């Protein structure tokens, strides 16, 4: 009593993400930098993530936004006209990002703020995307040969890439197999991939 499968594959997930991440509005470098500084500060504060998500109202807000304190306000200033009205084409990709971030832990939000601050989004994006592509089918537990250290990522217990993946429910090792795919990790790994792709897209 439905069409297609319950679950997409990596190609389908990447296509879904790219309908947003590859169709973003163009931002001038100064506006782009202010937006990224704002998002970095929002990722470091659980209340700022909530306040920003509430202000955007999934793109349904009518009327000028209420001014917010701190980083959530700094992001809102990059998405509104001088009147305080939200621009849907600027706000809707941020709504998708906030939606994906709801699946991630506070530890992962702080690591994404560090990745943003250090302009290191592509490394983690490639690692997560490669693990999602190579772990087909996601319903089955499997050991993988991909060694994250050989892709230029720091790898070992407590390294940023290690914590980011461990927080998804993957089983990690310092020796091969470095990563074991667990079906329980599907949602968090997909959300992490979408969040890194959107942050990379927003960074232009």
């Amino acid at each position: 009593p439905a069409e297609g499968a319950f679950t997409e594959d990596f190609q389908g997930l990447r296509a879904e993400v790219e309908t947003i991440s590859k169709e973003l509005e163009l931002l001038d470098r100064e506006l782009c930098q202010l937006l990224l500084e704002g998002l970095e500060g929002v990722l470091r504060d659980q209340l700022a993530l909530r306040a920003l998500e509430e202000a955007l109202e999934q793109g349904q807000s009518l009327g000028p936004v209420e001014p917010l304190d701190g980083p959530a306000g700094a992001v809102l200033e990059c998405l509104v006209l001088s009147s305080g009205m939200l621009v849907p084409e600027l706000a809707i990709p941020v709504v998708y990002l906030l939606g994906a971030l709801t699946m991630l832990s506070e530890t992962q939000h702080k690591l994404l703020a560090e990745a943003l601050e250090s302009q290191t989004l592509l490394g983690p994006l490639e690692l997560v995307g490669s693990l999602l592509e190579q772990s087909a089918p996601w319903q089955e537990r499997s050991t993988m040969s991909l060694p994250p250290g050989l892709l230029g990522n720091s790898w070992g217990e407590g390294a940023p890439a290690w914590v980011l993946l461990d927080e998804c429910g993957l089983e990690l090792g310092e020796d091969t197999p470095h990563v074991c795919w667990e079906p329980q990790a599907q949602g968090r790994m997909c959300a992490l991939y979408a969040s890194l792709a959107l942050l990379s897209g927003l960074s232009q």
Binding site: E25, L26, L27, D28, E30, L31, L34, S82, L90
Partner: peptide, 11 residues
């Protein structure tokens, strides 16, 4: 050839 695109700037 050239093409016109919309670019958002800080006020």
């Amino acid at each position: 050839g050239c093409i016109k695109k919309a670019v958002w700037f800080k006020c």
